[PDB]
Design a protein around this motif. Sequence first.
Motif, PDB file in Angstrom:
ATOM      1  N   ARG A 116      21.148 -32.211  18.733  1.00 25.18           N
ATOM      2  CA  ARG A 116      21.467 -31.677  20.066  1.00 25.18           C
ATOM      3  C   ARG A 116      20.764 -32.417  21.216  1.00 25.18           C
ATOM      4  NH1 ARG A 116      19.520 -28.488  23.872  1.00 25.18           N
ATOM      5  NH2 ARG A 116      17.656 -28.336  22.555  1.00 25.18           N
ATOM      6  N   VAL A 117      19.500 -32.796  21.032  1.00 21.89           N
ATOM      7  CA  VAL A 117      18.747 -33.420  22.091  1.00 21.89           C
ATOM      8  C   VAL A 117      19.273 -34.818  22.439  1.00 21.89           C
ATOM      9  CG1 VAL A 117      16.686 -32.053  21.752  1.00 21.89           C
ATOM     10  CG2 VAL A 117      16.850 -34.306  20.623  1.00 21.89           C
ATOM     11  N   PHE A 118      20.107 -35.366  21.557  1.00 19.56           N
ATOM     12  CA  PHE A 118      20.661 -36.710  21.766  1.00 19.56           C
ATOM     13  C   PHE A 118      22.084 -36.667  22.297  1.00 19.56           C
ATOM     14  CE2 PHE A 118      17.749 -37.129  18.005  1.00 19.56           C
ATOM     15  CZ  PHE A 118      16.683 -37.646  18.733  1.00 19.56           C
ATOM     16  N   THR A 119      22.607 -35.488  22.610  1.00 16.29           N
ATOM     17  CA  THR A 119      24.040 -35.348  22.918  1.00 16.29           C
ATOM     18  C   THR A 119      24.375 -35.659  24.382  1.00 16.29           C
ATOM     19  OG1 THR A 119      23.807 -32.950  23.225  1.00 16.29           O
ATOM     20  CG2 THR A 119      24.676 -33.707  21.126  1.00 16.29           C
ATOM     21  N   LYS A 120      23.366 -35.663  25.249  1.00 15.74           N
ATOM     22  CA  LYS A 120      23.558 -35.868  26.693  1.00 15.74           C
ATOM     23  C   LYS A 120      22.424 -36.745  27.191  1.00 15.74           C
ATOM     24  CE  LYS A 120      27.158 -33.278  27.075  1.00 15.74           C
ATOM     25  NZ  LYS A 120      28.456 -33.822  27.568  1.00 15.74           N
ATOM     26  N   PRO A 121      22.617 -37.422  28.333  1.00 15.63           N
ATOM     27  CA  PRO A 121      21.496 -38.187  28.853  1.00 15.63           C
ATOM     28  C   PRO A 121      20.288 -37.284  29.197  1.00 15.63           C
ATOM     29  CG  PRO A 121      23.540 -38.739  30.028  1.00 15.63           C
ATOM     30  CD  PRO A 121      23.815 -37.517  29.186  1.00 15.63           C
ATOM     31  N   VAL A 122      19.093 -37.829  29.034  1.00 10.90           N
ATOM     32  CA  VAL A 122      17.856 -37.129  29.367  1.00 10.90           C
ATOM     33  C   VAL A 122      17.899 -36.762  30.856  1.00 10.90           C
ATOM     34  CG1 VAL A 122      15.341 -37.336  29.592  1.00 10.90           C
ATOM     35  CG2 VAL A 122      16.494 -38.219  27.553  1.00 10.90           C
ATOM     36  N   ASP A 123      17.687 -35.484  31.160  1.00 12.71           N
ATOM     37  CA  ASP A 123      17.754 -34.972  32.536  1.00 12.71           C
ATOM     38  C   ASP A 123      16.431 -35.278  33.274  1.00 12.71           C
ATOM     39  OD1 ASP A 123      17.885 -33.402  34.885  1.00 12.71           O
ATOM     40  OD2 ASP A 123      19.182 -31.939  33.888  1.00 12.71           O
ATOM     41  N   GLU A 171      14.160 -32.404  33.953  1.00 12.86           N
ATOM     42  CA  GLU A 171      13.390 -32.009  32.779  1.00 12.86           C
ATOM     43  C   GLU A 171      12.332 -33.035  32.361  1.00 12.86           C
ATOM     44  OE1 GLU A 171      13.560 -29.015  31.685  1.00 12.86           O
ATOM     45  OE2 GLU A 171      15.197 -28.588  33.083  1.00 12.86           O
ATOM     46  N   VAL A 172      12.598 -34.325  32.578  1.00 10.76           N
ATOM     47  CA  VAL A 172      11.718 -35.406  32.099  1.00 10.76           C
ATOM     48  C   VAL A 172      11.714 -36.500  33.177  1.00 10.76           C
ATOM     49  CG1 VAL A 172      11.081 -36.822  30.078  1.00 10.76           C
ATOM     50  CG2 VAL A 172      12.585 -34.859  29.753  1.00 10.76           C
ATOM     51  N   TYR A 178      11.164 -40.352  32.630  1.00  5.46           N
ATOM     52  CA  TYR A 178      11.889 -40.977  31.502  1.00  5.46           C
ATOM     53  C   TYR A 178      12.390 -42.368  31.873  1.00  5.46           C
ATOM     54  CZ  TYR A 178      14.665 -41.485  27.268  1.00  5.46           C
ATOM     55  OH  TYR A 178      15.156 -41.943  26.063  1.00  5.46           O
ATOM     56  N   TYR A 198       9.352 -43.216  23.441  1.00  5.67           N
ATOM     57  CA  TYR A 198       8.962 -42.220  24.406  1.00  5.67           C
ATOM     58  C   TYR A 198       8.096 -41.091  23.807  1.00  5.67           C
ATOM     59  CZ  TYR A 198       8.967 -39.415  28.575  1.00  5.67           C
ATOM     60  OH  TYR A 198       8.580 -38.748  29.706  1.00  5.67           O
ATOM     61  N   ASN A 199       8.150 -40.911  22.487  1.00  4.39           N
ATOM     62  CA  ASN A 199       7.490 -39.768  21.830  1.00  4.39           C
ATOM     63  C   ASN A 199       6.674 -40.267  20.662  1.00  4.39           C
ATOM     64  OD1 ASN A 199       9.137 -37.395  23.250  1.00  4.39           O
ATOM     65  ND2 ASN A 199      10.658 -38.883  22.539  1.00  4.39           N
ATOM     66  N   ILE A 255      10.936 -34.758  17.178  1.00  2.00           N
ATOM     67  CA  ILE A 255      11.987 -35.576  17.786  1.00  2.00           C
ATOM     68  C   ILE A 255      12.098 -36.935  17.080  1.00  2.00           C
ATOM     69  CG2 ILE A 255      10.664 -36.443  19.779  1.00  2.00           C
ATOM     70  CD1 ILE A 255      13.299 -35.984  21.394  1.00  2.00           C
TER      71      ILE A 255
HETATM   72  C1  LIG Z   1      15.989 -36.804  23.983  1.00  2.00           C
HETATM   73  C2  LIG Z   1      14.542 -36.935  24.400  1.00  2.00           C
HETATM   74  N1  LIG Z   1      13.815 -38.033  24.301  1.00  2.00           N
HETATM   75  O1  LIG Z   1      12.605 -37.823  24.751  1.00  2.00           O
HETATM   76  C3  LIG Z   1      12.458 -36.564  25.162  1.00  2.00           C
HETATM   77  C4  LIG Z   1      11.193 -35.928  25.716  1.00  2.00           C
HETATM   78  C5  LIG Z   1      13.703 -35.898  24.968  1.00  2.00           C
HETATM   79  C6  LIG Z   1      14.037 -34.455  25.245  1.00  2.00           C
HETATM   80  C7  LIG Z   1      14.676 -34.035  26.408  1.00  2.00           C
HETATM   81  C8  LIG Z   1      14.961 -32.676  26.589  1.00  2.00           C
HETATM   82  N2  LIG Z   1      15.604 -32.182  27.758  1.00  2.00           N
HETATM   83  S1  LIG Z   1      17.027 -32.791  28.351  1.00  2.00           S
HETATM   84  O2  LIG Z   1      17.304 -32.244  29.658  1.00  2.00           O
HETATM   85  O3  LIG Z   1      16.902 -34.179  28.702  1.00  2.00           O
HETATM   86  C9  LIG Z   1      18.388 -32.494  27.237  1.00  2.00           C
HETATM   87  C10 LIG Z   1      18.754 -31.183  26.920  1.00  2.00           C
HETATM   88  C11 LIG Z   1      19.819 -30.933  26.057  1.00  2.00           C
HETATM   89  C12 LIG Z   1      20.524 -31.992  25.509  1.00  2.00           C
HETATM   90  C13 LIG Z   1      20.162 -33.306  25.821  1.00  2.00           C
HETATM   91  C14 LIG Z   1      19.099 -33.561  26.685  1.00  2.00           C
HETATM   92  C15 LIG Z   1      14.602 -31.760  25.611  1.00  2.00           C
HETATM   93  C16 LIG Z   1      13.958 -32.187  24.453  1.00  2.00           C
HETATM   94  C17 LIG Z   1      13.592 -31.197  23.380  1.00  2.00           C
HETATM   95  O4  LIG Z   1      12.991 -31.535  22.323  1.00  2.00           O
HETATM   96  O5  LIG Z   1      13.961 -30.015  23.530  1.00  2.00           O
HETATM   97  C18 LIG Z   1      13.680 -33.528  24.273  1.00  2.00           C
END
Ligand SMILES: Cc1noc(C)c1-c1cc(NS(=O)(=O)c2ccccc2)cc(C(=O)O)c1
Length: 130
Positions: free
Chosen positions: A29-36, A39-40, A43, A85-86, A96
């Motif tokens: 799920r965390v890889f399904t959309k660009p990092v916001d 939220e980060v 990045y 990044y992690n 992650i």
């Molecule tokens: C990917 C990533 N790479 O570095 C990190 C740190 C993450 C990452 C990013 C987010 N928040 S997000 O807004 O960018 C998002 C939410 C839902 C789907 C796709 C992205 C949450 C998490 C988590 O573990 O919950 C991790």
Amino acid sequence: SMQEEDTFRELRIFLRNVTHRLAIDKRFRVFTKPVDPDEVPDYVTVIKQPMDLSSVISKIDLHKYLTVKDYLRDIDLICSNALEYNPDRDPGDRLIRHRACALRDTAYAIIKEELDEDFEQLCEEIQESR
Ligand SMILES: Cc1noc(C)c1-c1cc(NS(=O)(=O)c2ccccc2)cc(C(=O)O)c1
Ligand SMILES: [Cl-]
């Protein structure tokens, strides 16, 4: 030719199916959309080539992948970006990284079981003649 365009269209269809499967997997799920950036916010300063599964679908649709190798390079980038990044020993980072590695392993395993090597070889030969 029309035949070569048919080959690339078949590759797109195959790649969309693989990507959709990876996108519906709850681990990824965390890889399904660009990092916001809300939220980060740092990045985009650390990671120079962000990649995610929605962007992969976009790139398929834009005809950016002419071989499975070019697709796997972007799967690899999703994984390497997460590792970069992690990198820490804490459980959030470890989780992650494990999921990133599982994404990459899953994509490679699907391709190994389901992509005919002669199909990939044809795509590569069309690409190289362009
Ligand atoms: C990917 C990533 N790479 O570095 C990190 C740190 C993450 C990452 C990013 C987010 N928040 S997000 O807004 O960018 C998002 C939410 C839902 C789907 C796709 C992205 C949450 C998490 C988590 O573990 O919950 C991790
Ligand atoms: Cl979780």
